[PDB]
Scaffold this active site. Sequence first.
Site, mmCIF file in Angstrom:
data_model
loop_
_atom_site.group_PDB
_atom_site.id
_atom_site.type_symbol
_atom_site.label_atom_id
_atom_site.label_comp_id
_atom_site.label_asym_id
_atom_site.label_seq_id
_atom_site.Cartn_x
_atom_site.Cartn_y
_atom_site.Cartn_z
ATOM 1 N N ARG A 20 32.979 47.993 -44.533
ATOM 2 C CA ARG A 20 33.786 47.881 -45.731
ATOM 3 C C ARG A 20 33.722 49.181 -46.531
ATOM 4 O O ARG A 20 32.645 49.786 -46.666
ATOM 5 C CB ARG A 20 33.298 46.731 -46.600
ATOM 6 C CG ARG A 20 34.010 46.635 -47.953
ATOM 7 C CD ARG A 20 33.111 45.984 -48.985
ATOM 8 N NE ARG A 20 33.665 46.056 -50.332
ATOM 9 C CZ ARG A 20 32.929 46.070 -51.439
ATOM 10 N NH1 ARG A 20 31.604 46.015 -51.375
ATOM 11 N NH2 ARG A 20 33.528 46.151 -52.610
ATOM 12 N N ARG A 33 37.377 50.758 -67.356
ATOM 13 C CA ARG A 33 36.446 51.825 -67.581
ATOM 14 C C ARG A 33 36.569 52.366 -69.001
ATOM 15 O O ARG A 33 37.612 52.887 -69.397
ATOM 16 C CB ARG A 33 36.680 52.923 -66.559
ATOM 17 C CG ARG A 33 36.195 52.537 -65.178
ATOM 18 C CD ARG A 33 34.782 53.043 -64.932
ATOM 19 N NE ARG A 33 34.290 52.689 -63.603
ATOM 20 C CZ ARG A 33 34.129 51.440 -63.174
ATOM 21 N NH1 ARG A 33 34.423 50.421 -63.971
ATOM 22 N NH2 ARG A 33 33.664 51.209 -61.950
ATOM 23 N N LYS A 80 39.665 37.932 -53.425
ATOM 24 C CA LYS A 80 38.350 38.077 -54.026
ATOM 25 C C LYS A 80 38.324 37.288 -55.318
ATOM 26 O O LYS A 80 39.035 37.606 -56.271
ATOM 27 C CB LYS A 80 38.043 39.557 -54.299
ATOM 28 C CG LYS A 80 37.700 40.369 -53.055
ATOM 29 C CD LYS A 80 37.689 41.861 -53.349
ATOM 30 C CE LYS A 80 36.272 42.396 -53.532
ATOM 31 N NZ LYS A 80 36.252 43.830 -53.932
ATOM 32 N N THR A 84 27.586 40.480 -52.172
ATOM 33 C CA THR A 84 26.888 41.069 -53.320
ATOM 34 C C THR A 84 25.480 40.565 -53.669
ATOM 35 O O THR A 84 25.249 39.372 -53.851
ATOM 36 C CB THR A 84 27.769 40.993 -54.601
ATOM 37 O OG1 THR A 84 28.823 41.957 -54.505
ATOM 38 C CG2 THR A 84 26.958 41.291 -55.847
#
Lengths: 487, 487, 487, 487
Positions: A49, A91, A240, A298
């Site tokens: 990935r 961000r 996701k 994760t």
Amino acid sequence: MSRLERLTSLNVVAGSDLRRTSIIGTIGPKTNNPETLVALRKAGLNIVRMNFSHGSYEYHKSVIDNARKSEELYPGRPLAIALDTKGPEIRTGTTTNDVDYPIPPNHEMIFTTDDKYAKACDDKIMYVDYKNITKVISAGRIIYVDDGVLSFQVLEVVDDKTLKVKALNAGKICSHKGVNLPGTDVDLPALSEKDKEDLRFGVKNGVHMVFASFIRTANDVLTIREVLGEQGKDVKIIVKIENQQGVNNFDEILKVTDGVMVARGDLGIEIPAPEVLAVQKKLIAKSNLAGKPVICATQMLESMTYNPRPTRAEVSDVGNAILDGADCVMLSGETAKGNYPINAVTTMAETAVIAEQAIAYLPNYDDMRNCTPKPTSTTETVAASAVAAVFEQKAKAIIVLSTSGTTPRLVSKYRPNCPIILVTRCPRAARFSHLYRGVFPFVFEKETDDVEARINFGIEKAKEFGILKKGDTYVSIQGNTLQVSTV
Amino acid sequence: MSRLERLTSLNVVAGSDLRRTSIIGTIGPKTNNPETLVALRKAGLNIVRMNFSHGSYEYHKSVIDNARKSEELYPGRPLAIALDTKGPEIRTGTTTNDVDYPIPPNHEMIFTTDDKYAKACDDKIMYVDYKNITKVISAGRIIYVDDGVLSFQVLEVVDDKTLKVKALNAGKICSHKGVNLPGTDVDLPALSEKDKEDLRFGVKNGVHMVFASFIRTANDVLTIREVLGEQGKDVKIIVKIENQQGVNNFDEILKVTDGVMVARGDLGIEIPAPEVLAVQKKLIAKSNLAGKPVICATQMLESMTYNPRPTRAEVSDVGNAILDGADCVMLSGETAKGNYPINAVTTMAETAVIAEQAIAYLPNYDDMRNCTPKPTSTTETVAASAVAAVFEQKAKAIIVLSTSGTTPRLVSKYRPNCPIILVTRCPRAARFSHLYRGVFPFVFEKETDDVEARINFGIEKAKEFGILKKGDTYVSIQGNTLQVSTV
Amino acid sequence: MSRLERLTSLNVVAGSDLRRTSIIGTIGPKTNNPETLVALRKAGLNIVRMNFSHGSYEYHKSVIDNARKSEELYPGRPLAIALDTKGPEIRTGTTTNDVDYPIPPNHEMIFTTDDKYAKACDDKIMYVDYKNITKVISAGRIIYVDDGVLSFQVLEVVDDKTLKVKALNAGKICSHKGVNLPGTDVDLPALSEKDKEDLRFGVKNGVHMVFASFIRTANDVLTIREVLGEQGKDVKIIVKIENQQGVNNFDEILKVTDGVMVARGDLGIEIPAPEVLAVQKKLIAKSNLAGKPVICATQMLESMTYNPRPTRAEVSDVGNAILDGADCVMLSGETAKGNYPINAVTTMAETAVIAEQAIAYLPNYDDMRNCTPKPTSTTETVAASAVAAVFEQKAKAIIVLSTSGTTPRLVSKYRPNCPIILVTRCPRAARFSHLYRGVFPFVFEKETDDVEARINFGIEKAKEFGILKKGDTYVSIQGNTLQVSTV
Amino acid sequence: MSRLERLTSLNVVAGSDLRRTSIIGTIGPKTNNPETLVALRKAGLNIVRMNFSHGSYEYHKSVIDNARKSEELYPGRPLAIALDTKGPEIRTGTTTNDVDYPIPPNHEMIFTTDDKYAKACDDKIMYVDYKNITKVISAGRIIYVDDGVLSFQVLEVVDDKTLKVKALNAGKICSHKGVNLPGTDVDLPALSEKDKEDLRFGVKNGVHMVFASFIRTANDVLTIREVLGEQGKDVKIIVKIENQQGVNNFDEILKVTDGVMVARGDLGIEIPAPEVLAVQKKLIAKSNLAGKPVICATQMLESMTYNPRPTRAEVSDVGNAILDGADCVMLSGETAKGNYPINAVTTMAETAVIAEQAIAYLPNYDDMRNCTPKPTSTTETVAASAVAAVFEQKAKAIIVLSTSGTTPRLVSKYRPNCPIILVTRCPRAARFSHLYRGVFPFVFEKETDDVEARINFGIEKAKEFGILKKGDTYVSIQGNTLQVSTV
Ligand SMILES: [K+]
Ligand SMILES: [K+]
Ligand SMILES: [K+]
Ligand SMILES: [K+]
Ligand SMILES: [Mn+2]
Ligand SMILES: [Mn+2]
Ligand SMILES: [Mn+2]
Ligand SMILES: [Mn+2]
């Protein structure tokens, strides 16, 4: 049914059975090179990935032909490349004098989206590159900053670029870190103008999957389906789930998608941490029913980044995700930023085998067929049916020829307790088939009075893996018949 | 039976139900003081644990009256003190110039037990406080150092105090860390001369439990039972399974013991790491059947020591341990050496409630009764029976009067999906009853035409916890009858 | 669950267990006398039934004090008298020269209701005591005569007392036989002016039950409930299902009734014969759920009237009715008009014991609790609960004190695999409790610190039946507690 | 699993589904003729049975070509002839002055086997054609005479041809009636010198089965297997269980046999009458497991001999035998000696359809596979597997091509809830396949790229029976594959 007698009998110790769950591993600068890419694949890496959250197409195009390179040096199991969208994230701006880090204690301040303070922002104000938060956000909401280490009770809404806020907790304000909006319907496109390019870049570069980050609704999927284009019809869309919008809607989303990944990371930031536990098993179970490939990801062996030995929780989490029905296991920074990536795949792997010798194959199988048998598509009836066959005759394998990865995926759905040898001529399906748990693809060429050869490919190919001992008992599938001959 | 429909319906989000699994928390110098001990108890700490591996009786006696002190400042739930034997371990010598840490890469060196190098040892030699390893050990054996982060293939046996060895992996050699002997019959007693004193010290000091480390066989239990003495008959022996000798024998050990704790730590060092996964659920399941209180412990929220937020694995491990049948959850260095102990209990807790709203109470209950019903001790028949009662009438509670903690433990075994209010006059049973999952003890005094009062204690005491709404429906237990009146 | 392993293990041969299903037996002139009434009761007769379709109150009042007389000569098991309504039927006229029996082959003839041909009727015309059929009937309808041995396609409607008809089949036309109207809404009341008297006569005469023939709807029950009156509140209404109106409505009828009897006879004439098979088990199953006492009746050992040995079907029908859930077994002409009534009860009996040693007590018990547990009346929760108790400890009995026959009926519903000893002071409940399967009533007098005595009545009374061996294990029930002491 | 909800939902009334259980019918002089043989076959007669207990080969050879004749007049379903051995029975001598019938009340007398009293015997003495009873019999034993109407406590053993005896009950002694030996190991050959001839006569005459009466052990089967000879390898041996020797051994007998029939008749005389109930369901269940075809027989609608309407027990016995797993239903004197044989088959039939709409196909199927799956012969794995297929896709049929009747018998074992269309070229298998429940054979000729035609035979042949509606869904079986195409 004796769950207790199933449990009391667990009879541990990894035995003879080959791991059936594919191991997904993210690649970092370190890991980007054939030699390592190999020790990795040898140890168990199935799919690779590439997180498109960072890196130039140079930074990435590198990774690919390097994996393609590892395939050259030694093919082993076919490997699969997968693009992982740098979804619509947030961000914050940068701190004025570079790395300056003012420290809010629990004070009131003000977030803004002007860019005039982009490079020059801190303590007094804060930049956020999501020009709309002011609309989608509402006083009372609680913003999070950098892995949710910081909180910010939305006090007010000044102007329409200004937001009066208060640090709900301490910490020092740094530059460029992700902003999480717990409980806020973000209208950000699951895909951005650049993401459309990263996909198109991937398609061109022949990556087999795509893990669209931050999916909120079905359209988002439909969108990334067409953006992928005609040339990318054969590539998989692995939704996701990392926010409420994606859970409070999963069902309609599950419909149209190919797969689904429990994007634990943000998901754990998005919604309450403890909630995940249930919000995890629920989506995998729902996935299983739908028959679509699910992936747990994760922080599974997070600590195994700075350490060679994983923790108790981590080990006893890798195995559990598998018991809950996960088709694949992931590895983020344990491979893309860690000191012991080889051990990572090596521990995951070892745990998956013990985690599959505990499953209740017969009862789990039944339960799965007692859900919507009415029906049932012919390929699924033959799928379920073949599985039952092996449960009876104690078959060792279950060779099935395919090209769509449909037939082997469905059998997968019915989780047999024996290897699912998929013989194929399409190289692409053989690579993305590591998505469905238990499938051992192999590529066969040349070119229905010939399928006996392909079946002999899988059988002999099975033999090299020591799956068949001759005079064993296997079940085949093809056109839709269903075989059950011996070795 | 619809595990899939049970799964697909998980309907997350911690609801109204009160946590049923008690939270065990080790105490460190930091945590040793009333104020903290309170914030801890308030957050969810049920039982306190003192690791007798370090600390002077001054170091410990402190902890106790401090907890006793927290009880004074504010009683809340009755708390329980518990001694944790500094079992027969093997601590390595110290590094010469204090904290000097030489780094072996994969070289040959030499372990010795001379004490002449105790305080002065490193890189070239190494001290080990187990004077006999030389005998019990054999060339080929693989020694482990500090949470088994380091390996040492026994190359040879020099002298009888010397051992030629080779680091099977990297790392820097530090001072005083635990040495693990995977595959070596150690001749050290579960209890040592000092341990006999720590127990006696604990008994005297009125600690309710004991977690005997490194138990290998039934005798060991029998031994710590008598060492405890007549004055300690009322205290519980919680066997700690952390080696092969303890697993390759669990069944005969389970017999005589009161409880059992999956001493994950060493266990994970002792035997293969991945093996634990199954070796965990198996022992909890076996415990459940036997009806004895089991405890999961070590590294559940390990990272939550240096961080306020736990990981995915950790959260999805606290919940799992509960699904697998654990009666209690532990906390080692997350309370005795961590920066965020309050959040620790606070995360464990929050997860336990979501982890109990996923259980299959009805089917799990059945499965449990279909194992050895023949019989069944009268207290257990009434136990199981009462549980069934609530499953029918949808009872909210299940008040049971006791003194042995027998009656409430058995019901526990049958895991009702409602609070088990145990009314008692014995203060001791009310403290150690947090051992059995779901039991909410309360102490009642004064002093069978009077039990109606005690039943009104629990009912009203239930009401304060909002467990009963009056005109609800509860089931009582006493002499052996079985009630089922309304509120 | 292993139905096949339950079946393959049937291990036949009537063993030690006492018959649990009460045997109902109709009494004829022959059987009417103490001596016989005794040999009958001794052999197994539990309840006596008097068909009020024939006989003067002299004809009946006789039967009663004769049974009461058998009770005197030797009490044995308490016996129960039961009136069986001569419901709204339709009896055909008589054949002219007495027993003359003209034989229709398949000819056309003519039914009339003139009474001018009542005593003088045959071959050419036929009398029917239902003055309205002409209205409720319609050309095309198919009349049935004498146990539906004869059919009559309604050709036309002559006058309004005349009906042109054709024998749809052979046979000889006799006198006074029942006429069945398949598919015709009859306007005759479940109860008639006389029936109101027979009931009142029965109430007065202290008969414990009533089997209302031809019930069509709930009102009918409500009606016979009030007609019974205040003095008859304590008597049971056993609805008789023998028509479509009674089935196409059973559920609403089941509600208000005490019991239900599968009046096979007419029912088999009323609706298709083969249909019964399912229409039988369905009503018993529905009854079981509702918890109300059901009875199978008519032609079980029919042939055992002219013969001493019953047939295969009959034997393998007595047992089946019990497997399907029947609480009682009946005997019509095998006792009220047969040559071998003693053998009848004696064969029924012997078969019931083999038929109860084949039941799946544990699984059948579960299935029953998984239907509407929500709740569940406290007496039913304690009912079900007690039953479970014995399943665990392998209890031999289950003494329960009552007066309403409520508590013992409910346990019954949960079919324990051990005798249900009901201790009572009310003589009436002890007589009608043979309605609920498995209940062994006993009457105790004098007169909650005393129930121990009544419990010692049942225990000792249990001992005389060899049900308890002392140091056995029984479960009590009373105020609502639940005991579980030993012998 | 909801047996109660399965029962409470029975939803009676014979619907659209075609009867799956074949109807066996014995033929008497009356019934011996094409016309009747047809109305019989049309009504439902599948197989014909000829009791070789009476009749000359003229008496029988007639029956056959008459049935063969009915096949000519109108083929309809293929019919099957079956010989029914006049096993080793016991016919007492004749009464002196012809029909003289002396009446024993309860006196002592004497049975002998001299033949000197053969034609001349009564009151004082009795002849029995079993020359060995004196050896196999023992004082205390209880002989039975003529349908066990009479009993005879063996008082003593005079000489070795003499037996002192006492009538245990009344009745008049007649001539030539069957003698039953309850509890006596008879050494009579299951086959006699004549029986060897009747079989050989049958083989020659092409009868498909054989129902060997009075089988006691496996050898007996082995014997009738070889006596049948090479020319009779293809004919079926249907063991008849009618004594203790045959039950206290069934398991070893079940092994080698093809089928088994619960010879209720003598069996009910042989052993206790009530015992049958369990001794019936047990053998059918055991048969089902073994997979071999079982048949229930005798007195199912006995009364339907002298009457047109059957009883309650009889109807509710025909259906039950089917629920217990019977593959075929028989008819003895209801066809070979009755007034209403057409109605007989017509009532049996009608009941079988309602009796199959009550079965629990899914759960019954599972239970059957959970018994010895290890395994499982490839034809049985494909058998079970195909069945599952239809349960999923709700298939309507299940066409399987065969010649051994192996493949269709096995599927039968797994009782699908849809027609099992067996396409065959062998005429013999198509006739004896009515032995396996649910199989609808059809004969196809001419003559693996051609089986599509045969499959089109069964499909179209299915269509004529209205089993398939095109665009339905069927499952095929052949070489061993397994299909699942559409219509
Ligand atoms: K990403
Ligand atoms: K310790
Ligand atoms: K009546
Ligand atoms: K015969
Ligand atoms: Mn994310
Ligand atoms: Mn330890
Ligand atoms: Mn009637
Ligand atoms: Mn016979």
